[PDB]
Design a protein around this ligand. Structure first.
Ligand SMILES: [Ca+2]
Ligand SMILES: [Ca+2]
Ligand SMILES: [Ca+2]
Ligand SMILES: [Ca+2]
Ligand SMILES: [K+]
Ligand SMILES: [K+]
Ligand SMILES: [K+]
Ligand SMILES: [K+]
Lengths: 448, 448, 448, 448
């Protein structure tokens, strides 16, 4: 009775090799210090849930929901997978300049790679489907709190200084005017950015926001020359950026209710791997020589992607919105009514997953072919399916408490020849004709 | 009618011996001051709840949930156990340097061990199962509150100083410009870090965050030489660190609906035991000699683990999603239809937990073997189970208000020989054949 | 139909005698000033609610809840009792040193005792039961709010001083740099600390947190010598400390579904009674002599405990999960089927609370003994209970609208001899045999 | 079907006479200035709701609620009364010292009395009942917000002074270190303090908290001598202090399910009436003479109490938990079965409120005397009530669609002699015996 679905999981598993995230050990002296792997068993492991369905059940008229074929791709709390992993913990290596100098970089630290962003792109092979809705629904409309302060202050002062010179009196008056502005807003360390290039493609990117630059990771900005310590505050790097990331997003595609052909849906899951480079700069000043710490933002990044795809055939029986049944000729042990390519009807061995043996019993009482809902079983000519119309010969009702299917127009029962299974209309059975018809729901809702 | 489960508890009990958390009494003089136990009846006591189930009931088609075999491992409010325990209360010992000096560490305190972190690792013996979802769902996306302030201040001052010298007048003007930035965020003393190396393994770690270092536990940083007191603020160490810790987490594994074989699931519960070492450093300055307190972070830690495991056989009857019944031949006191290894049918003494005597009565009316859902009881050949298909001889219905099982194809009843229990189809009973069949639900949902 | 319970209250009443909380009048001069009672009709009055039950109803298979025997001990809003009481109000006594001095304590106040902590310990006599869950669920994971501020300030100043000496002009420039850190967190005056030593014992302690020391109760730290007043701010001592304390906690124990024997559960409710001692110290300085107030933390404390216990017999009928009935032989005025020690059946005068006359009517239709669910009433041999199996002679059904119990295998009715009550199977009653059986629910759910 | 209650209101009305709150006009000169009434038609008007009930309905076994007899005393939103009233508005009188002086109190104001506290004490005459639960559930566990701030500030200053003497340059450097602690918590002007001396008595006191002292009511602390004004800020005295106070509290007592005898419950409602005295102290100083305002805390207080009480008979029929019926012999116009003191049965004129004519029709079908649930109507001997047991002669069922009560054991109907109403068992009625029995619910749930 309820709306049928085609539901399946898509596993996206992609181990990231050691060479796939090997970067130069240093950014200032990239040609001298060699290279090393900045990850440790990096991996992508996601599980998408895909649903195919019609927007409404078969034959429902006057609904407030438009008729459409819906493809829903979801990565939610019920089905997410392990996630994207880069590192168990972050380490660093320190490198010094092989030659001494005066005003240049003399030290460098390279920290294990973090995820600059995670990107998930949903594409479509053709334009038969359009994005109907997504989750997250939209980019954030940031809320700001503004605050204006105005103040004044009035003061007086009376002093009395007594010394050998003589009494000395002071009188002072002060007036001050103050004005300040405040701005308050919220950030996160990863901000979701939704980017919809056109009706067929949308991408969700979780981008580093609060500490996005290597410079922002420094807990100290200046130091004395004798200080030689790691200047990065690793506590500012959340485990969300290397240990495990799981996105939450939904994409709903829709096609027109009369769409034909097929469409490939592609999901691109990627992580922008970014090693962190920091350098110490020697500033020689006559007053005092100090070192200043800097982060390099032009350092290399590598995007590691895994693509998953599935094909949707818009003529799949799930997009009729109905639950099909078969018509089994019960004089035989295993024979069902089957429709071939040119609409003719034959009796073949029943197959529960064969859509050519599936019919939808609609509201009018017609048996419409599940593979082509424009064709009906017509009692006037029971050798080929006929175009659905309002013919009374196309309407059937089940005789109560029996296995007889009767035609509405004439009241005759659907019978089949006991030798060949050829269908016909008969007032009553005889030696050569059986009136026993058995119907059961078929399972045509497997992804094929 | 509802979906069956296999549910059981796994107790993880591990007393931690005195030697398992014996550390050096001192960190600076580890070879001189001996060792002592830093715990007091440390213990791990957890109770995991495991559920085995199918994602859907047997034979349901067109659902929005994909077909899958689900393994759920839970440590929640309904079933958690005592928890992980290290100490009733924290004590300390003070040690002094055996030799006096000038600029070195001269005092040390070693505090009873706390839990640096609690780690729970969920592994899998092979890749037949993948992590589908977890709780906690993901690592935290930290929210920051930024605040920008800009201000200006204008002032004037008018002074009048009178003395023996003569009247003196002052006029002053001030202008100030201010700019400040605020950053606000929340921490905890234990932060959950989710780490999913691949599709088969996930680890949850509760890591000390707010006071993670021995240095952060010092309530004072400097003191005069004559001061000799414990410099650690024990109020900063919550009872969550040593008295009792109970995690809350769920892991859901999934296997394909056609998975075979078996899989071992391993749960590793561990605590990273960390003694706390602090030292007082003597700083001799000509202006003034003082002592500065330091915490040592390179001090030893010991991880104490307890592993629990259970085996899941993917061919368990619970993963069919149906509730099996037996077919008892009621002419005998105790005889049931039983399937042997090669599919033949015999009559044996009924066993309520024998899956070889269990059948699922499906929607079509077939009796499919619970141990192999591809085999049916077929009325055409009642000596071996046959492959499930759409044969009408494989469909059975119960005659109303009787103990007769009738075949759909021919209408004959299932009968058994009164001496050997051999099955057959009969229009009516006779002296040698009984038509009495009794069915009851079997209990095949025990973990075996 | 629903799950039966054994429910009862445990009253824990313990008046605390005057000598049980008599402490020394002074801490500095404990041998000179005598002793006094620091309480006023101190009392412990708690009411625990205990529930015994099975986790599931009898015979339920395939549930997501594991089979277990549950013991629930609760002290909640529905049943708590009066609480723990120490004082109606807090008073103090002042004591002075009998000898004058220069730099020593010269005054002391001893305040009426408060509760340093309230402790509730749940123990178990053996390891047949394990803690499954508690309330409070765990120790608190404290949440901290961190705040970083950075600022700069730029200023200019222009002064013009005019006097007899001549015009004088001033020009000044200021630059400031500021940095501050904030840490915010919540405390209570009593913090719950959960301490689970092992799988059998858990203790909950409400420990003073915000004002835990006598020093923290002083509203003033220094004073002039002539000042002679009580230096304790009694408003900082909440009525929760002495007037009435009621804990809220739950402990759920579980045993194996096949546990035998018995187990003693012990509840230890205690209060750590602590008198408050403060002293005034005379500090003689040439610049100025003052007095500083101090609190003494090494002052004595006394723990006053009351132990309650109850015994759980794991073979109690409540742990079957079923609601038993008796089988009354209705030809007699008062005769029921009774099982003796070795399984034989006799007719004895009915007792509604006798578990030897109680049977569970299970899903199969068997009458299993409530005192031993492995024994059934078997129609093949109606003189001794038989091991439960799938025998059809062990299944019974009630003939509709009558008082006849019929055997499933043969259809014969259960009858009893009209003189001795010996059971048997009969097609019909006669002069010596009655077929009238009456069944009613028995009350075996009293704590015994 | 549902659980019966005995419900009634207790009105506590106590007008407070003028002399009952007449205090001295002054505190410093109490013997000179006379006395006056500090209230204006002070009054106590409260309405308590009392419920008597059993914890469970009659005959319910296996419940998670223990069997108990419950007495509930409530003062809630549904039933509270007018409240406690002291004054329409607060006025004051000013008094001056009859003799002038130098350093002493020279003025005094006496303000109309406020309520220092409202106290409600629930007592019990004996220990048959214990406090099971209350509302408010417990004393408040105050929550504190702590805040630590640490900061540093660095500054430089460059000055250039130009005058006739010559150019003068200044260079300054500043460094500051700051540290602050914050503590935040909530108070009310009336705090509820629960005080449970033992299992039988609990008191609730609403005590003034925020402005509890006469000193805290002063809006000014010092003034010049010529100032002569009322120094009390009457806006700090809420109308809750004098105009109307209504408490909200519940007390639930429980007794053993087999308790006998009676118990008196006492409710003491009182208000601690407190006049407010303030004085002005003349401080003569050579620099300047001023007056300082003081409040006196040792001023008199008077507690005005009204006691209400009610008696609970633990053998009241409401504590059976069942709804009784009577057995009316319907051959008479007005005759019911009645039980006398020694258990004999007679026919007397029916009284709907007579518990001696009330029976509970229990689950077994027994007619249990409502005044003594250990006695049943037994068909073997219908002249005296018999001890309840499992006799089949003690079970009755109503013949359908008739007024006949039939015995379960023999099937005979309960009949009564048409002249005397003597009960008996008869197969059929005759001229001297009527089989017509009429039953109706009786109203035994009035407080008696
Ligand atoms: Ca509408
Ligand atoms: Ca849907
Ligand atoms: Ca489930
Ligand atoms: Ca329960
Ligand atoms: K602000
Ligand atoms: K701020
Ligand atoms: K702040
Ligand atoms: K603040």
């Amino acid at each position: 009775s309820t709306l049928p679905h085609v539901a399946f999981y898509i596993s996206v598993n992609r181990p990231i090799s050691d060479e796939e995230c090997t970067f130069d050990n240093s950014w200032l002296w990239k040609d001298e210090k060699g290279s090393r792997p900045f990850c440790k068993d990096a991996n992508i492991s996601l599980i998408y849930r895909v649903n195919l369905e019609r927007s409404l059940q078969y034959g429902i008229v006057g609904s407030a929901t438009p008729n459409a074929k819906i493809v829903r791709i979801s990565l939610d709390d019920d089905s997410s997978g392990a996630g994207i992993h880069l590192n168990d913990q972050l380490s660093y290596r320190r490198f010094g300049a092989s030659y001494t100098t005066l005003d240049a970089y003399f030290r460098e630290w390279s920290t294990d790679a973090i995820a600059q962003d995670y990107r998930f792109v949903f594409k479509t092979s053709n334009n038969k489907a359009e994005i109907l809705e997504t989750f997250p629904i939209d980019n954030l409309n940031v809320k700001y709190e503004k605050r204006k302060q105005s103040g004044f202050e009035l003061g007086v002062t009376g002093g009395a200084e007594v010394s050998e010179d003589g009494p000395k009196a002071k009188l002072e008056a002060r007036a001050s005017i103050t004005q300040s502005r405040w701005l308050t807003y919220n950030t996160q360390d990863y901000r979701v950015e939704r980017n919809a290039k056109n009706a067929q493609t949308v991408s969700f990117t979780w981008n580093r926001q609060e500490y996005a630059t290597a410079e922002s990771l420094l807990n100290r900005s200046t130091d004395a020359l004798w200080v030689d310590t790691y200047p990065v505050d690793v506590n500012r790097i959340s485990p969300l950026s290397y240990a495990s990331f799981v996105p939450k997003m939904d994409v709903i595609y829709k096609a027109s209710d009369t769409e034909t052909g097929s469409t490939d849906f592609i999901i691109d899951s990627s992580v922008n791997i970014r090693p962190i480079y920091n350098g110490a700069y020697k500033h020689y000043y006559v007053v005092g020589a100090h070192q200043s710490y800097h982060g390099f933002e032009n350092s290399p990044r590598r995007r590691i992607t895994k693509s998953a795809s599935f094909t949707v055939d818009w003529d799949h029986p799930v997009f009729t919105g109905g639950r099909p049944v078969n018509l089994q000729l019960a004089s035989f042990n295993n024979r069902c009514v089957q429709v071939d390519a040119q609409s003719r009807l034959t009796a073949n061995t029943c197959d529960d997953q064969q859509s050519a043996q599936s019919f939808i019993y609609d509201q009018l009482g017609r048996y419409v072919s599940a593979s082509n809902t424009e064709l009906c079983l017509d009692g006037a000519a029971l050798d080929v399916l006929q175009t659905c119309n309002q013919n009374l010969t196309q309407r059937w009702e089940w005789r109560k408490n029996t296995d007889e299917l009767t035609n509405v127009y004439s009241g005759e029962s659907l019978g089949h020849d006991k030798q060949t299974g050829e269908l016909g209309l008969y007032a009553s059975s005889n030696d050569a004709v059986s009136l026993r018809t058995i119907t059961a729901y078929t399972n045509v809702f497997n992804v094929q």
